[PDB]
Amino acid sequence: VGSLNCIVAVSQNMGIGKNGDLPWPPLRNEFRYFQRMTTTSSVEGKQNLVIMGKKTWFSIPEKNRPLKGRINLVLSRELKEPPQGAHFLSRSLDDALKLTEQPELANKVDMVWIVGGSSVYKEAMNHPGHLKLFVTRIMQDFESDTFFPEIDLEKYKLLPEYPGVLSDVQEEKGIKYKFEVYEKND
């Protein structure tokens, strides 16, 4: 297991979802970015592991589940078995990671990516150790029901730039957004 990262798209009000749906219209380039990042292994012969909650898992069109090219790990305490189409199930992030430290996935996983939800984002942010926040900022308010927890700038530094991430404003569907990387280690 290489790096631990969280990837998220948040609106201006800090909204990540509305009724299991995204608060804004689909953004094809936001999607491509999310797929490239999570799928691209920094090491040949290895795969990235994407960790998500049950809600997140069920929020993706089936057509797209599991996220191909990556190991899908759903986090649940009520499921007794992995949803249809998923590869592993854990009760917690502490357990999903130990799983990685098993000879099972021992020698198969590069980087580990958390794709949601809040709860999952919140246990990653408590995980002591090195952590990178890959944030996509949508520059508008959008009716949301779930949120990204607030980032503590006293612990997370905003990087001036990152290889492979565009620094200027993007626009798709009259909607503006930018890419940001935050890094912690404490």
Ligand SMILES: COc1cc(N(C)C[C@H]2CCC3=C(C2)C(N)=N[C@H](N)N3)cc(OC)c1OC
């Ligand atoms: C509605 O359509 C889709 C929705 C989803 N969702 C909701 C999960 C995503 C998509 C984008 C994204 C994710 C989560 C995130 N955590 N961080 C970044 N920044 N952005 C995933 C899909 O295909 C994989 C899909 O197919 C079109």
